[PDB]
Design a protein around this nucleic acid. Structure first.
Ligand SMILES: [Mg+2]
Ligand SMILES: [Mg+2]
Ligand SMILES: [Mg+2]
Ligand SMILES: [Mg+2]
Ligand SMILES: [Mg+2]
Ligand SMILES: [Mg+2]
Ligand SMILES: [Mg+2]
Ligand SMILES: [Mg+2]
Ligand SMILES: [Mg+2]
Ligand SMILES: [Mg+2]
Ligand SMILES: [Mg+2]
Ligand SMILES: [Mg+2]
Ligand SMILES: [Mg+2]
Ligand SMILES: [Mg+2]
Ligand SMILES: [Mg+2]
Ligand SMILES: [Mg+2]
Ligand SMILES: [Mg+2]
Ligand SMILES: [Mg+2]
Ligand SMILES: [Mg+2]
Ligand SMILES: [Mg+2]
Ligand SMILES: [Mg+2]
Ligand SMILES: [Mg+2]
Ligand SMILES: [Mg+2]
Ligand SMILES: [Mg+2]
Ligand SMILES: [Zn+2]
Ligand SMILES: [Zn+2]
Lengths: 214, 127, 97, 25, 97, 91, 201
RNA sequence: GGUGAAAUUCUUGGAUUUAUUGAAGACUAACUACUGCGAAAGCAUUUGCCAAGGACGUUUUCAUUAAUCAAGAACGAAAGUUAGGGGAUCGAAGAUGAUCAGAUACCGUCGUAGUCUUAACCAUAAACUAUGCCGACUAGGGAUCGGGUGGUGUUUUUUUAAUGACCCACUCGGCACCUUACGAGAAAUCAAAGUCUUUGGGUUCUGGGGGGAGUAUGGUCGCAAGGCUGAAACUUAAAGGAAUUG
């Protein structure tokens, strides 16, 4: 004698700025009654959409994104960065036998003071003419690849918030400066950022947040 | 084109779950389990069941609003079997075959940088 | 007596590896003695692939298989998986197929 | 009987004759 | 390292150990660099420092106790301060210090 | 000339109270009676005098510490954890 | 009669030219001649007194106030402390876990002094003989030694009498018992050898 | 939920599923291999620090300083013990749900100690290659790990190089595998288990039919549990190994 759907207030999800479709999807709440309202209650949920489902082209089939809801207005709720994950399949595929895996991470701030820890993975590659059947690095190789990745990733951040960092990551500029520095040490294939998580946001700043909008 | 949500099909042995939610997760929409749609414990996970539950589940999905939905299929995981149950397939199968849309579906099985000792002790389950 | 130079399986110059847990019965078993299978397989399956792209958005989509490494305990590897048991000679052949 | 179980057999058996001899110390 | 430079100073130069005399050093402007131990109390410190700036002597706060500074200079007792008068082959006066 | 096989300072209790207890008391007597390194002037001359109070022969500094030892394990970690959290406030 | 040493700490008097002295329970590692800082805007060092509001969770303090300015009530015995385990800034509260294991939530203005109380471990040491007990209570109160109520005549105690010594009835007494009845295990909601780990969840 | 099937159990306390965040302790998945290192036990996230090592290179240095070892000593998986801490997980004991003729078990649940760590004990494992160490010699092949050498080799573009990773030949020293077998073995098999009635390079240690029995005893070490050392009476015609056909 209820059926919450005869009572669910409804809603649609809007995305930020540095992508393609600002429109994402729909949601449900509960009519903003006196004592417990649809506003302040939830909103502050999160949503994971593959950015190939967000940027259009599938050269992006992996690479998932975490968007969070901060502010809301009349059947319209905006969203801002909250993370970026890979996919299980790609990773589980990238990790082949017969080759060295190399991972490394760092914790670092931005201008607009969000704190994050981004990750990075690479794999030693066979060189085209290789006779031996595996290709492994010399540890000393691996420590030096990590140190560069590290030297690189710490530079890439503290540039104009995730804002720019977001704009930085999407076309994977980082990926190739890695590839750049690296090739002086060792072959290496794939080479991605793979993960980045958020752990200490600044303060709301209704002004600044509203900058990705229009 | 559609209105979107998330599928999330947990298929272990002994039972298979299906339940669509708001693409944010916080808000449900219709569940129903393999156990629900037949009665004999032993059969609580069979594809023949997971179908009839994915039947009920699709119905409420298109009866409330969701026109489409991405799936995140999943085994027990942790320190357990890690491999998909029987009724993951049938469910998926019989829920796209219900006239709902499919789009970009990954496997969200939890997998650990191993440990917390598995159960059943160093000598295995001997029976 | 002896009926394997590799003794159990695969450890020359180590003295101690480290035990994994059998995917089937959970028996502990040294990693090098383990017996392993890469269970790479489609997320969908046999029949579903048509009714996949049929009731979907996107063109043909992409499709992303599931990959996981399987470890058996001999007894479990024998009871079902890779084993049979082989003649005194067939034994020595390590070639997969 | 299993060797390990007979090794325990006599292991006990000693711990008992150990006992009875102390009554006499 | 700094101790390595220090023990070079010791075996080719002229120094003096401990409070009263590295004050005589400071008054006569004979001191080229005084070295103050971690734990020596902040009066002794502040005062030496005062004396120091009055003769313009650069001061090196030795991260380490009077017990080690004694070892630093190869003596089996403890020293709270060392004073440099002649720097041997060592470059202490004109390195990072 | 090794005087006793294993009782050490715990000799005084002769035979009474039983090994176990004597063993325990020995451990902490040795703890509580011993001379310690002075954090300030740096001569091993902190001797005890009533639980918790550790003072220095010369230089005369007196520090609150453990009941039978200068620094209790807990209070030390507490030291270093206070290090950590304070770090969080200038950084 | 005190496990832990005291620290005599002297202050200037804000309002009159003169020294005014306080009696602090010494936290471990504070020492003679050390400068002690007390106040809202004061730094996070061992020995200072700070209002639980201003210290990050995980802080470890002593002699903490139940209500602001009660001049210090919680954890004072040689070896104890309390741990801030989070704050709720609106209605400035601050949740702590006391020595007992209990969590309790008090005003953020409640002061506490950073550290643990000195003299820890005092109870690890066997008294050994009756005398050391004796000399212990000699400076506490007249509670020692203790005649077993079961060795008294019945005039004397619920346990008294019998032709053998025995409690003769359940020794777990009701909370609602009446004076002259409550001797035994008052209000005991279990009894027997505590097996298994303890430690509040 | 769990199983072969179940039941104990959990569920207006919205279980199980979902979502966001938080805490605890353990662990180090995939990459992981007939790959590495260490005297053995053993060792797999990063990064700093601390000292250590082999192999290699060497027209450096000392110059017999060495090989092996009763006594004695360092270390020594798991469990177990002492005193703290920790106590997520899994879990001897215990209790239960089932199964069973029974079922003190196998299977399911609750779960103590334990599992982790500090200080200290204990000194044992199929602690296994069931194969002592140093030296010599005797026979083919392709991989590989480390080091070095050689090349008008490849790939990296810039302006050629320099590098780096690769390729090819060689050579020390590793972890193994291949095929042979002059040879050895009771055989299985073995580049040593070969160079042994054609019996000798140097040295350590252990065994002498089976059971009695690693029992008794003494000594000794240990908090203990127990470790080391360790008999005899009596009994007995086989125990045992490897291969063969059933
Ligand atoms: Mg056999
Ligand atoms: Mg046989
Ligand atoms: Mg071993
Ligand atoms: Mg008697
Ligand atoms: Mg009295
Ligand atoms: Mg009494
Ligand atoms: Mg009494
Ligand atoms: Mg009487
Ligand atoms: Mg009564
Ligand atoms: Mg009475
Ligand atoms: Mg009575
Ligand atoms: Mg009695
Ligand atoms: Mg890893
Ligand atoms: Mg002797
Ligand atoms: Mg010996
Ligand atoms: Mg436990
Ligand atoms: Mg039982
Ligand atoms: Mg029963
Ligand atoms: Mg039993
Ligand atoms: Mg042995
Ligand atoms: Mg073996
Ligand atoms: Mg050869
Ligand atoms: Mg070359
Ligand atoms: Mg006969
Ligand atoms: Zn198994
Ligand atoms: Zn002193």
């Amino acid at each position: 004698v209820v059926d919450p759907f005869t009572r669910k207030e409804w809603f649609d999800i809007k995305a930020p700025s540095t992508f393609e479709n600002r429109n994402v999807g729909k949601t449900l709440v509960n009519k903003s009654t006196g004592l417990k309202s649809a506003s302040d209650a939830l909103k502050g949920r999160v949503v994971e959409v593959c950015l190939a489902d967000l940027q259009g082209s599938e050269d992006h089939s992996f690479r998932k994104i975490k968007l969070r809801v901060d502010e809301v207005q009349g059947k319209n709720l905006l969203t801002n960065f909250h993370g970026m994950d890979f996919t299980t399949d790609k990773l589980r595929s990238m990790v082949r036998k017969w080759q060295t895996l190399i991972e490394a991470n760092v914790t670092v701030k931005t201008s607009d003071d969000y704190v994050l820890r981004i990750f990075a993975i690479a794999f030693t590659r066979k060189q085209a003419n290789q006779v031996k059947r595996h290709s492994y690095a010399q540890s000393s190789h691996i420590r030096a690849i990590r140190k560069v990745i590290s030297e690189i990733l710490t530079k890439e951040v503290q540039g104009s918030t995730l804002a720019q960092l977001t704009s930085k990551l999407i076309p994977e500029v980082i990926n190739k400066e890695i590839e750049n520095a690296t090739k002086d040490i060792f072959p290496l294939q794939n080479i991605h950022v793979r993960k980045v998580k958020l752990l200490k946001q600044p303060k709301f700043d209704v002004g600044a947040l509203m900058a990705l909008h229009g | 084109s559609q209105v979107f949500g998330v599928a999330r099909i947990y298929a272990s042995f002994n039972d298979t779950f299906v339940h669509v939610t708001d693409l944010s997760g916080k808000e449900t929409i219709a569940r129903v389990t393999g156990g629900m749609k037949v009665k004999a414990d032993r059969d609580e996970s069979s594809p023949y069941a997971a179908m009839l539950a994915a039947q009920d589940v699709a119905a409420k999905c298109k009866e409330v609003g969701i026109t489409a939905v991405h799936v995140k299929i999943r085994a027990t995981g942790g320190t357990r079997t890690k491999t998909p149950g029987p009724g993951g397939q049938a469910a998926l199968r019989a829920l796209a075959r219900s006239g709902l849309r499919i789009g970009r579906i990954e496997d969200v099985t939890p997998v650990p940088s191993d440990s917390t000792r598995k159960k059943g002790g160093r000598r295995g389950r001997r029976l | 007596p002896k009926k394997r130079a590799s003794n159990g399986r695969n450890k020359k110059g180590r003295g101690h590896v480290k035990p994994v847990r059998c995917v089937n019965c959970s028996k502990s078993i040294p990693k090098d003695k383990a017996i392993k299978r890469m269970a790479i397989r489609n997320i969908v399956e046999a029949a579903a692939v048509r009714d996949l792209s049929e009731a979907s958005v996107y063109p043909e989509y992409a499709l992303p298989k599931t990959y996981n490494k399987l470890h058996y305990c001999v007894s479990c590897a024998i009871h079902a998986r890779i084993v049979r048991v082989r003649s005194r000679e067939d034994r020595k052949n390590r070639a997969p197929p | 009987m299993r060797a390990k179980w007979r090794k325990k057999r006599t292991r006990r058996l000693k711990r008992k004759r150990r006992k009875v001899r102390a009554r006499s110390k | 390292s700094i101790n390595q430079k220090l023990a070079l100073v010791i075996k080719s130069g002229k120094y003096t150990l401990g409070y009263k005399s590295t004050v005589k050093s400071l008054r006569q402007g004979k001191s080229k660099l005084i070295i103050i131990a971690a734990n020596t109390p902040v009066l002794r410190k502040s005062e030496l420092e005062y004396y120091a700036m009055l003769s313009k002597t650069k001061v090196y706060y030795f991260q380490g106790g009077n017990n080690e500074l004694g070892t630093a200079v190869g003596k089996l007792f403890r020293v709270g301060v060392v004073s440099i008068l002649e720097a041997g082959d060592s470059d202490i006066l004109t390195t990072l210090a | 000339a090794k005087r006793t096989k294993k009782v050490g300072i715990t000799g005084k209790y002769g035979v009474r109270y039983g090994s176990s207890l004597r063993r325990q008391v020995k451990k902490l007597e040795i703890q509580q009676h011993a001379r310690y390194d002075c954090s300030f002037c740096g001569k091993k001359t902190v001797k005890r005098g009533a639980a918790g109070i550790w003072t220095c022969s010369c230089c005369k500094k007196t520090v609150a510490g453990g009941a039978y030892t200068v620094s209790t394990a807990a209070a030390a970690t507490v030291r270093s954890t206070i290090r950590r959290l304070r770090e969080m406030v200038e950084a | 009669g005190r496990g832990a040493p005291l620290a005599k700490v002297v202050f200037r008097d804000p309002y009159k030219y003169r020294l005014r002295e306080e009696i602090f329970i010494a936290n471990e590692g504070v020492h003679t001649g050390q400068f002690i800082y007390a106040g809202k805007k004061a730094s996070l060092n061992v020995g200072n007194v700070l209002p639980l509001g201003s210290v990050p969770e995980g802080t470890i303090v002593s002699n903490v106030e139940e209500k602001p300015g009660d001049r210090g009530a919680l954890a004072r015995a040689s070896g104890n402390y309390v741990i801030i385990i989070g704050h709720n800034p609106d209605e400035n509260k601050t949740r702590v876990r006391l020595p007992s294991g209990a969590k309790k939530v008090i005003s953020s203005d409640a002061r506490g002094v950073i550290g643990v109380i000195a003299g820890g471990g005092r109870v690890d040491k066997p008294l050994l003989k009756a005398g050391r007990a004796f000399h212990k209570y000699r400076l506490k109160r007249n509670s020692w030694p203790k005649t077993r109520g079961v060795a008294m005549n019945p005039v004397d105690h619920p346990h008294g009498g019998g032709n053998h010594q025995h409690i003769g009835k359940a020794s777990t007494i009701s909370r609602g018992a009446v004076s002259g009845q409550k001797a035994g295990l008052i209000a005991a909601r279990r009894t027997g050898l505590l097996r298994g780990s303890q430690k509040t969840q």
